[PDB]
Amino acid sequence: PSMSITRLFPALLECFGIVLCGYIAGRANVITSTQAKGLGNFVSRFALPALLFKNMVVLNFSNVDWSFLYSILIAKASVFFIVCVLTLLVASPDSRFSKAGLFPIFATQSNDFALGYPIVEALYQTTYPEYLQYIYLVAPISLMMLNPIGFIFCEIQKWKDTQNASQNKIKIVGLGLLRVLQNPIVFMVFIGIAFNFILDRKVPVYVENFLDGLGNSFSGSALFYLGLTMVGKIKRLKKSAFVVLILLITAKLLVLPLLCREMVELLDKGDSVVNHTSLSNYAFLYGVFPVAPGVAIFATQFNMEVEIITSGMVISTFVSAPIMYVSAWLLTFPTMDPKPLAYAIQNVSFDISIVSLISLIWSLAILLLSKKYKQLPHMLTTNLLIAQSIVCAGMMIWNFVKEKNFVGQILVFVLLYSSLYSTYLWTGLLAISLFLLKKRERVQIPVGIIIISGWGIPALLVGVLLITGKHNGDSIDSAFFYGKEQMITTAVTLFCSILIAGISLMCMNQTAHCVSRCNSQSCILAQEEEQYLQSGDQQLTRHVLLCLLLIIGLFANLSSCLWWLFNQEPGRLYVELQFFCAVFNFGQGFISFGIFGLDKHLIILPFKRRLEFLWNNKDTAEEEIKMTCQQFIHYHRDLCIRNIVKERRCGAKTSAGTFCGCDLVSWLIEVGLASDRGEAVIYGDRLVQGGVIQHITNEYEFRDEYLFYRFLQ
Amino acid sequence: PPSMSITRLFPALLECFGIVLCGYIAGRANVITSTQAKGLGNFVSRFALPALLFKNMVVLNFSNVDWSFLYSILIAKASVFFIVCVLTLLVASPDSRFSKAGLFPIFATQSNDFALGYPIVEALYQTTYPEYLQYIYLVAPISLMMLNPIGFIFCEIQKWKDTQNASQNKIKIVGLGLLRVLQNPIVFMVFIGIAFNFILDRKVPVYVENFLDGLGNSFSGSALFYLGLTMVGKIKRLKKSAFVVLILLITAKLLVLPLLCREMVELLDKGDSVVNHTSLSNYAFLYGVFPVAPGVAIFATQFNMEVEIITSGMVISTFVSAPIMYVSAWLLTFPTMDPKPLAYAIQNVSFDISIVSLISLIWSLAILLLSKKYKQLPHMLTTNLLIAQSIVCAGMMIWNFVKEKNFVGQILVFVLLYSSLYSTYLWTGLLAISLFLLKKVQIPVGIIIISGWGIPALLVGVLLITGKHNGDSIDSAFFYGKEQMITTAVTLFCSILIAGISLMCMNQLTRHVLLCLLLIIGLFANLSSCLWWLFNQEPGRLYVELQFFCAVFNFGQGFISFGIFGLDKHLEIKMTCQQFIHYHRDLCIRNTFCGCDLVSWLIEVGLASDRGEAVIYGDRLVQGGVIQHITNEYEFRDEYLFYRFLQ
Ligand SMILES: CCCCCCCCCCCCCCCCCC(=O)OC[C@H](COP(=O)([O-])OCC[N+](C)(C)C)OC(=O)CCCCCCCCCCCCCCCCC
Ligand SMILES: CCCCCCCCCCCCCCCCCC(=O)OC[C@H](COP(=O)([O-])OCC[N+](C)(C)C)OC(=O)CCCCCCCCCCCCCCCCC
Ligand SMILES: CCCCCCCC/C=C\CCCCCCCC(=O)O[C@@H](CO)COP(=O)(O)OC[C@H](CO)OC(=O)CCCCCCC/C=C\CCCCCCCC
Ligand SMILES: CCCCCCCC/C=C\CCCCCCCC(=O)O[C@@H](CO)COP(=O)(O)OC[C@H](CO)OC(=O)CCCCCCC/C=C\CCCCCCCC
Ligand SMILES: CCCCCCCCCCCCCCCCCC(=O)OC[C@H](COP(=O)(O)OCCN)OC(=O)CCCCCCCCCCCCCCCCC
Ligand SMILES: CCCCCCCCCCCCCCCCCC(=O)OC[C@H](COP(=O)(O)OCCN)OC(=O)CCCCCCCCCCCCCCCCC
Ligand SMILES: CCCCCCCCCCCCCCCCCC(=O)OC[C@H](COP(=O)(O)OCCN)OC(=O)CCCCCCCCCCCCCCCCC
Ligand SMILES: CCCCCCCCCCCCCCCCCC(=O)OC[C@H](COP(=O)(O)OCCN)OC(=O)CCCCCCCCCCCCCCCCC
Ligand SMILES: CCCCCCCCCCCCCCCCCC(=O)OC[C@H](COP(=O)(O)OCCN)OC(=O)CCCCCCCCCCCCCCCCC
Ligand SMILES: CC(C)CCC[C@@H](C)[C@H]1CC[C@H]2[C@@H]3CC=C4C[C@@H](OC(=O)CCC(=O)O)CC[C@]4(C)[C@H]3CC[C@]12C
Ligand SMILES: CC(C)CCC[C@@H](C)[C@H]1CC[C@H]2[C@@H]3CC=C4C[C@@H](OC(=O)CCC(=O)O)CC[C@]4(C)[C@H]3CC[C@]12C
Ligand SMILES: CC(C)CCC[C@@H](C)[C@H]1CC[C@H]2[C@@H]3CC=C4C[C@@H](OC(=O)CCC(=O)O)CC[C@]4(C)[C@H]3CC[C@]12C
Ligand SMILES: CC(C)CCC[C@@H](C)[C@H]1CC[C@H]2[C@@H]3CC=C4C[C@@H](OC(=O)CCC(=O)O)CC[C@]4(C)[C@H]3CC[C@]12C
Ligand SMILES: CC(C)CCC[C@@H](C)[C@H]1CC[C@H]2[C@@H]3CC=C4C[C@@H](O)CC[C@]4(C)[C@H]3CC[C@]12C
């Protein structure tokens, strides 16, 4: 085939696994926000310029398909113009120009240097190496051919914010051109092309090793920095921000790639038809690359729409992962026979199930080891996760026993499909559970009937399925193992949960003295914050959002099954739906891990008790902090802490020496003793370790939460 | 074919010590401050290096390893360990003897082989003997597992001496040292990689192969950048006792250890093929010369014992490794070729050293002229020396590009080159006594300039009246015959005692003294080589060593010159200013300020992190309209300058 699709998944794992490694490192405060700036400077000013220089000095401009560049550039310009006008017409008068200057850039710029390059190299190295050059051609060319328009639009906006007695516009045009010329990519590309013309595409040997060493350390480093910068960016957005972000992501990952594919298929005059289809697929894939992080730094330099654009970049990368994975497979699909189609869909199911089960084992271990599964909603989603991991295990066994005798086929098929239906109806069970918890407090919600339904009814349905039906037939896919009776059974067992999901969420919206440690009465405020904590740990919004991201795939499964039931014609319209079902059914572990495998609940609460247990395993028989504490006590004890630390009369006796953790973090941020919330909590943990800060009851360690801690001495 | 790809060694060094230099000026120009470097350090120590070890050791084949040579390196390292430990124990202050005996021997045994050693070993042995690449991931982890526990136990003993209690059993300190060693990402990662190598069949899963390759390839360049980033503001003035212990430790690291490793290899190894054993011993020598690993510095700062000595030793070892790792590798590959190839190799190494050194001289003379230092007479002597050095390097390159060519241009390049070279010696010679006359009086600039340019021209003239250039000689020292060489000897003759009698006037600016001292030592080496040729007249596989040494020096002192002079210390905002006037303007700052004083106050209070962050904050307040120099003539800097506070 044209693309090595089988090697797409590992590269994606490298592309995002490092980013996840850059996230958990930045989430566990391993690398603070300030410490990430050093890595950012290294990747931006030293690794990227060397990469561009080395990759374009050898570049042969005489063997460059300029038609491909023309097609991509006209596609980008057309979408730029479309969004620019569609913004200038309706956007708010006060800041129409600011929106019109950044949104086209967000919809046209791609993260191709750090994220696009590994994927392109994995897919196109043994077939079409020539595709690798256009990343270093299109991105810088489009960086100086489209960005200047947005930049001068931003200058117009800031002039509207700084109106003066001026009429000429040469100043703003010059400033906007200087802004794009000061980008390291642009002038590094200019220098690289100049030196390419100076030399004969032969980097000097004395400097080639240096350039290679400084350039090879960009890809992984850039992904790590992207993961570091992807920490604490996406927050709650207004519904208008919600819809505009939906539109922008659609323009970047659904409109632009289609425009590029159309432009390539219209402009390319290549005689080889196979090369033409490969060119079109490559252009389409190049469209799907996520929003480059440079848009966020552009916006914060301009200081306009920073939060929305940063959330857009982060969410764009998130959706670019599965959209790219689905896309490339869809393009490679119409080149192989249906039996290879089944082989490939089984392979992608196996891979997605492997990674999903690993993530789900991690999440289940976190949930069970933290003892948070005891409470009801958490127990329910826990059962859903066990179902979602059993289905992945069954997918693995299925991949290892497909096309084998029926004796063990019974057990493998029942094991897979009981879990599948368990997830299906457990979605609706979560829906009704949230519905009734919002309907009233202390609702009866018999957990026994719910568990023996989400785990019992699927057993009954799979049992009646196995009793009847015509199980004969050499069917590779699990969907057609028994035949029409099995698919009819899947359809009805699908529709119910969607019916439950389709009603519960609607009503969900419709319904919606002393100084030291003090006595339980003298520390009654500690009891109030304790009751606030147990008021938390419910994460209802997380549960309902989980329900929505599951019912999306549930609707996809409904469409796929009813299509075969009624239309009963593949016609290439059903194969893509089968692929989407294979992706969702065995990939739901990815979303479950993404909402619950890594949250703000395993930072220190389970870590502290794990460390305590490790210490107690041996306890039966076996200075920088000091300087920081000295600084705090000789310099920042007579400061605004005086009103920061205070406790109201706790009934009759009060500590009067307690402060709020979030208030302390905000105070440290505002004074500047720390950098951000992470540095502030690191400072607080150090000061706690110094015997200066401790909880009023010592029950909880210091954290960025509405918890009330004493200042001791 | 040669056992080591010597011709590829120089660019790889330029690959490493270039990127290291990139990490230096990045941190020197405050692009990446001290705190900013910690993110890079964490990324390279907890994500890049562990992945590199995992990937390289899971696929590593333990059944195809020449174990004997690995054993030999461990015995050599243990021998140096034993010698340094016992020698430090016999002579040391009894208040810190244990700390000195715990940190010095590991300094002489641990090497920077993952960041610096690996690229060089790869360059030297990739197209001929790839099997050498495995030992860099076997010699190091085994050495960490088997050597540093003793030094860590010694450090814990010293801490016990500082924290004496009523306990006798040493199981606590042994356990603590073992746990601390095991807690490093370069031991437990070894254990995990070996466990997975045995579990698997040395085939990393395809779902993780790309991830490991992406996370490991971003180490070497990033590790070198972090090394150069930590290599700023570490080396400082030390005491004479500190000086001698430092020189002894560095000599043990780069001279005693490689020779002892070579000896141990030629005993223990039983290779049937002589070529394999010779190349293997050369590998042992080249491993012994790797500079001190930065992990020793983090060990010292963790124990908080002898931080400055250990850091300075690491920095200076990294500096001195490159010249030694170059000349020793060249000398090791020397005895395998015909003498005309040796002469050609000498010309090539001279050319490479000369071109890099000439770029360096452009930098250094630019430092002296743009800063107007060269106008001042103590740097005027420095700069005419540096220009002479630039001309001799350039003449070396033109010599290489015109060797064995027409005499009508060969004589011109000959005079152009040796005028400047005889100059270089003549200058450093008389600049000894000239520094005498500058520190102790009138000095005529005309006489010194016409003695540094005219007198060498006088020897050149009296040389070309009576000489024999008739034969074509690729080497330049003997192109014009013994008359040239005795004239070379005479220039080396007069210069050394003129400098030698000057020393009787120095001890019986300090930067210039250091220049003069080191170049005088190099001139002594050249004089020894020339003396050796002029009376002994026997190569004996030795003249090639001395001739290569003076080729390295005479065309490579400019490296010293730029390294001393080329890098000198003499060469958004609204919020923080709002915070400054709320909580810190009324603080002890109120009690014109010296810029160093306010930088120090900021460091004590904690608004900044280090000197670089403090000066960045000061300049940012300057751009914030708060800090201003008393006249506005200057800009914020860390020096004894009085700056106003505005309002
Ligand atoms: C504007 C000021 C800043 C930029 C720096 C100055 C401009 C760029 C350098 C000069 C112009 C380009 C010259 C090289 C190309 C033409 C000549 C050529 O090919 O020579 C081949 C020759 C090689 O010789 P050769 O090709 O004859 O090969 C024969 C080699 N033997 C005999 C051994 C077999 O030189 C080079 O390789 C080019 C110079 C490379 C430099 C070597 C390392 C020096 C370290 C510093 C490098 C520069 C850093 C600049 C940093 C800038 C940012 C601050
Ligand atoms: C100690 C707790 C933390 C450690 C993590 C959990 C333990 C380690 C992983 C499980 C145990 C070892 C399993 C591998 C050995 C046997 C399986 C094997 O190799 O067979 C090949 C099989 C693959 O099957 P295959 O080789 O037949 O592949 C053929 C595939 N087709 C048919 C499509 C061509 O599995 C693997 O590749 C290895 C395990 C999967 C890992 C894939 C990456 C998942 C992403 C997350 C990685 C885990 C991160 C852990 C981080 C921990 C610290 C935070
Ligand atoms: C031995 C036999 C097995 C060896 C296996 C070898 C391979 C592993 C290599 C080395 C293992 C040991 C190294 C660990 C040392 C101690 C760790 C340590 O010590 O690290 C501390 C450093 O300081 C962390 O400190 P912390 O604050 O306590 O951590 C709390 C933090 C808050 O989120 O939790 C976390 O996520 C951090 C915990 C990370 C979990 C995050 C989730 C990522 C994991 C899996 C799911 C991936 C699939 C999902 C996406 C798939 C596609 C992308
Ligand atoms: C045009 C056609 C030609 C261009 C060629 C293109 C290729 C390069 C690509 C782009 C270049 C320009 C773009 C860079 C932005 C401008 C700089 C910039 O903008 O970067 C600022 C940082 O933000 C500069 O900061 P600074 O404060 O001005 O520097 C002061 C500082 C204090 O010591 O001095 C220094 O050392 C810093 C000064 C560092 C230079 C010192 C010399 C080091 C180099 C070589 C020889 C070393 C020899 C020794 C070892 C030899 C073997 C290893
Ligand atoms: C989960 C809910 C899902 C809801 C989905 C709803 C779909 C709507 C489909 C119809 C709209 C089509 C696109 C035209 C834009 C319509 C304007 C719009 O959506 O709202 C503009 C938004 C409102 O802002 P406002 O409420 O005034 O806020 C004031 C305080 N900030 O103002 C802004 O935020 C400023 C930006 C306005 C311009 C946005 C342009 C978006 C890009 C469109 C690209 C289209 C390309 C495709 C063309 C054909 C390709 C073949
Ligand atoms: C084998 C030779 C070894 C030589 C080793 C020593 C020289 C290495 C190269 C110079 C090292 C840095 C010199 C300047 C130090 C200051 C910091 C720095 O690098 O600047 C960052 C700069 C980014 O640009 P700037 O304008 O600062 O920022 C824009 C503002 N938004 O970044 C840049 O623009 C790039 C500067 C860093 C170099 C990275 C690679 C750039 C291209 C280098 C080509 C190869 C070098 C030879 C020159 C070409 C001739 C062949
Ligand atoms: C109007 C035209 C629509 C056309 C649709 C065509 C297919 C979709 C292509 C574009 C998709 C754009 C998705 C972008 C989502 C942006 C929503 C957003 O901003 O959500 C923010 C939210 C974070 O929530 P926050 O409030 O910060 O934190 C509290 C959470 N408890 O975070 C979230 O909740 C993130 C939500 C996104 C989840 C992933 C979505 C994947 C979509 C692509 C999958 C592949 C195609 C799907 C086809 C489905 C067919 C039925
Ligand atoms: C295809 C896989 C994709 C999966 C992506 C997500 C998982 C990647 C693996 C874990 C990523 C980091 C998880 C932990 C984050 C917390 C910070 C951290 O890394 O801890 C630092 C720790 C240092 O070691 P420690 O002894 O804890 O500290 C020494 C004290 N001076 O650091 C360490 O010990 C090293 C932790 C990072 C590991 C880097 C790579 C090493 C090999 C693991 C490969 C990835 C997992 C796949 C396993 C394949 C083989 C089974
Ligand atoms: C006693 C046994 C003798 C054995 C001889 C053979 C062994 C050779 C290998 C070991 C040599 C290591 C040399 C290291 C010297 C350490 C000097 C030191 O610690 O001084 C610190 C000093 C910084 O002083 P500071 O006050 O910060 O700066 C003042 C500014 N002017 O900084 C300095 O002054 C740094 C001085 C660096 C010297 C580099 C010498 C290069 C050697 C390698 C070249 C090849 C071999 C040359 C052999 C010479 C033979 C004549
Ligand atoms: C077709 C796909 C499934 C191929 C494999 C891609 C995975 C490597 C991707 C897909 C979904 C991704 C996750 C989607 C969402 C999140 C949440 C995100 O953090 C949050 O919880 C949100 C808050 C924030 O981002 O600041 C961090 C990245 C992470 C774990 C992503 C990590 C990488 C994942 C698992
Ligand atoms: C191939 C299939 C399996 C899709 C693969 C991709 C999904 C697994 C990813 C893509 C986008 C991700 C979502 C992007 C954004 C968020 C918001 C995030 O919420 C936060 O903002 C966390 C912080 C907080 O607000 O408390 C929680 C994870 C979630 C739902 C992510 C969950 C995992 C998702 C759906
Ligand atoms: C045989 C050699 C010449 C082969 C080529 C190797 C070079 C790439 C090496 C050798 C000499 C090295 C230089 C020797 C001395 C210096 C000065 C040094 O600065 C200091 O003295 C630090 C002072 C401080 O941090 O305060 C920084 C590294 C540098 C430029 C070194 C960078 C790397 C160089 C040029
Ligand atoms: C064989 C030839 C090519 C020599 C190659 C090595 C030299 C270029 C290097 C090796 C060690 C270097 C020295 C290591 C440390 C320093 C200390 C440094 O002094 C400082 O601390 C600078 C800052 C300050 O104190 O102001 C001055 C340069 C110097 C002598 C370096 C000068 C250059 C040296 C001799
Ligand atoms: C073999 C096929 C039919 C799969 C069905 C297996 C059945 C017998 C097993 C496998 C996993 C089991 C579940 C695993 C975990 C839990 C959570 C616990 O708090 C209650 C029981 C419950 C909910 C179990 C019920 C029975 C269960 C569903």
Q: Which residue of B has its CA nearest to A213?
A: B221
Alpha-carbon distance B450 to B430, whole Å? 12
Rounded to whole angstroms, the maximal C-alpha distance in chain A is 91
Q: What is the DSSP string of B277-325?
A: HHHHHHHHHHHHTSPPPTHHHHHHHHHTSSHHHHHHHHHHHHHHHHHHH
CB A52 within 8 A of CB A193: no
> Which residues are bridge partners to B644 per DSSP?
B628
How close B281 gets to chain A, by Cα (Å)? 27
Please, what's the b/e burial string for B311-348 (b: 16 or more CB within 10 A of its CB; e: otherwise)? bbbbbbbbbbbbbebbbbbbebbbebeeeeebbbbbbe
Alpha-carbon distance B150 to B24, whole Å? 34
The token pair that represents A551 in the structure block: 């019912």
- By the 10 Å C-beta count (0-12 exposed, 13-18 middle, 19+ buried), A647 is classed as buried
B183's CB contacts (< 8 A; 6+ apart) are none
Tell me how far the alpha carbon of residue B30 lies from the centroid of ligand 1, in angstroms: 27
Alpha-carbon distance B379 to B359, whole Å? 20
Substitution target in A21, A34, A208, A209 with the highest count of B β-carbons within 10 Å is A209
CB A324 within 8 A of CB A581: no
Q: What is the DSSP string of A572-593?
A: THHHHHHHHHHHHHTTHHHHHH
Q: Which residues of A are annotated as a binding site?
A: 9, 23, 232-234, 542
Substitution target in A48, A221, A623 with the highest count of B β-carbons within 10 Å is A221
Task: Using CB atoms, pick whichever of B22, B33, B605 lies closest to residue A635.
Answer: B605
Q: For residue B220, list chain A residues with Cβ-Cβ distance below 8 A.
A: 213, 216-217
Q: For residue A354, list chain B residues with Cβ-Cβ distance below 8 A.
A: 207
Q: For residue B35, list chain A residues with Cβ-Cβ distance below 8 A.
A: 34-35, 38
> Which residues are bridge partners to B629 per DSSP?
B643
CB B637 within 8 A of CB B615: yes
CB atoms within 10 A of CB A632: 20
Q: Is the CA virtual torsion A54, A57, A63, A64 positive or negative?
A: positive
Residue with tokens 């990127």: B19
Alpha-carbon distance B171 to B181, whole Å? 15
Sheet holding B593-594, edge to edge: B593-594, B642-644, B628-629
How close A644 gets to chain B, by Cα (Å)? 15
Alpha carbon A625 to its chain centroid, in Å, reads: 35
B153's CB contacts (< 8 A; 6+ apart) are B102, B173, B174, B177
Q: For residue B47, list chain A residues with Cβ-Cβ distance below 8 A.
A: 21, 25, 224
Residue with tokens 């590094």: A188
Check CB contact under 8 Å for B14 and A670. Answer: no
CB B526 within 8 A of CB B485: no
Alpha-carbon distance B483 to B476, whole Å? 13
Which one, of B620, B593, B591, B623, lies nearest residue B607 by Cα?
A: B620
Q: Which residue of B has its CA nearest to A15?
A: B211
Alpha-carbon distance B586 to B338, whole Å? 78
**Please, what is the end-to-end C-alpha distance for chain A in angstroms?**
72
Q: For residue B11, list chain A residues with Cβ-Cβ distance below 8 A.
A: 205-210
- Ligand having the closest approach to the CA of B568: 13
Ligand 9 atom closest to the CA of B560, numbered from 1: 39
The token pair that represents A288 in the structure block: 């799907």
Alpha-carbon distance B288 to B58, whole Å? 26
Which phi and psi (to 5°) does residue A554 adopt? Answer: -65, -40
Task: Using CB atoms, pick whichever of B12, B35, B214 lies closest to residue A14.
Answer: B214
How close A36 gets to chain B, by Cα (Å)? 5
CB atoms within 10 A of CB A594: 15
Which one, of A509, A580, A589, lies nearest residue A541 by Cα?
A: A509
How close A371 gets to chain B, by Cα (Å)? 29
∠ CA B300-B301-B302, nearest 5°, is: 90
- Reported residue count of chain B is 647
Q: Ligand 8 within 6 A of A362 CB?
A: no
Task: Using CB atoms, pick whichever of A46, A217, A640 lies closest to residue B218.
Answer: A217
Ligand 7 atom closest to the CA of A247, numbered from 1: 1
A659 SS3 class: strand
Helices B307-333 and B274-288, packing angle to 10 deg:
150
CB B368 within 8 A of CB B383: yes
> Which residues are bridge partners to A710 per DSSP?
A658, A694
> Which residues are bridge partners to A695 per DSSP?
A709
Check CB contact under 8 Å for A205 and B11. Answer: yes
CB atoms within 10 A of CB A230: 21
Q: What is the DSSP string of B49-88?
A: HHHHHHHHHHS--TTS--HHHHHHHHHHHHHHHHHHHHHH
- By the 10 Å C-beta count (0-12 exposed, 13-18 middle, 19+ buried), A162 is classed as exposed
How close A444 gets to chain B, by Cα (Å)? 47
> What number of CA atoms fall less than 13 Å from residue A527's CA on the CB side?
10
Q: Which residue of B has its CA nearest to A24?
A: B47
Tell me how far the alpha carbon of residue B25 lies from the centroid of ligand 4, in angstroms: 8
- Binding-site residues, ligand 7, Cβ < 6 A: A 234-237, 242, 245-246, 249-250, 254, 315, 319, 322-323, 326, 541-542, 545, 549, 552, 555-556
Which one, of A623, A632, A627, A626, lies nearest residue A674 by Cα?
A: A632
- Binding-site residues, ligand 5, Cβ < 6 A: A 82-83, 86-87, 90-92, 99, 240, 242-244, 246-248, 251, 255
B225's CB contacts (< 8 A; 6+ apart) are A42, A46, A214, A217, B19, B20, B22, B23, B26, B40
Closest C-alpha residue for ligand 7 atom 18: A242
CB atoms within 10 A of CB B91: 8
Region for residue A166 given its phi and psi (left: phi exceeds 0; alpha: psi -120 to 50; beta: otherwise) = beta
Check CB contact under 8 Å for B36 and A37. Answer: yes
Alpha-carbon distance A66 to A76, whole Å? 15
Q: Which residues in B338-395 belong to E strands, given as ranges?
A: none
The token pair that represents A473 in the structure block: 């037939």
Alpha-carbon distance A140 to A291, whole Å? 15
Residue A524 belongs to what H/E stretch?
Answer: helix A524-535
Check CB contact under 8 Å for B215 and A640. Answer: no
Check CB contact under 8 Å for A122 and B210. Answer: yes
Closest C-alpha residue for ligand 8 atom 12: A21
Ligand 12 atom closest to the CA of B231, numbered from 1: 25
A147 SS3 class: helix
CB B208 within 8 A of CB B19: no
Residue with tokens 């490793």: B261
- Binding-site residues, ligand 6, Cβ < 6 A: A 45-46, 49-50, 53, 182, 184, 204, 206-207, 210-211; B 14, 18, 21-22, 25-26, 29, 31
∠ CA B623-B626-B632, nearest 5°, is: 70
Q: For residue B36, list chain A residues with Cβ-Cβ distance below 8 A.
A: 34-35, 37-38, 41
Q: Report how many Cβ contacts below 8 Å link chain A to chain B.
A: 159
CB atoms within 10 A of CB A340: 11
DSSP 8-state symbol, A334? G
The token pair that represents A94 in the structure block: 């006060």
Which one, of A402, A395, A404, lies nearest residue A343 by Cα?
A: A402
The token pair that represents A395 in the structure block: 């997918």
Q: Which residue of A has its CA nearest to B30?
A: A38
Which domains, from first to last, does chain B contain?
Answer: 6-330 (1.20.1530), 339-566 (1.20.1070.10), 574-644 (1.10.10.10)
Substitution target in A20, A46, A219 with the highest count of B β-carbons within 10 Å is A46
Which one, of A109, A571, A71, A123, lies nearest residue A331 by Cα?
A: A123
Method used experimentally: cryo-EM
Which one, of A255, A261, A217, lies nearest residue A86 by Cα?
A: A255
Closest C-alpha residue for ligand 8 atom 43: B51
DSSP 8-state symbol, B30? T
B593 SS3 class: strand
Check CB contact under 8 Å for A351 and B207. Answer: yes
CB A563 within 8 A of CB A575: no
Please, what's the b/e burial string for A272-293 (b: 16 or more CB within 10 A of its CB; e: otherwise)? eeeeebbbbbbbbbbbbbbbbb
Q: What is the resolution of this structure in A?
A: 3.3
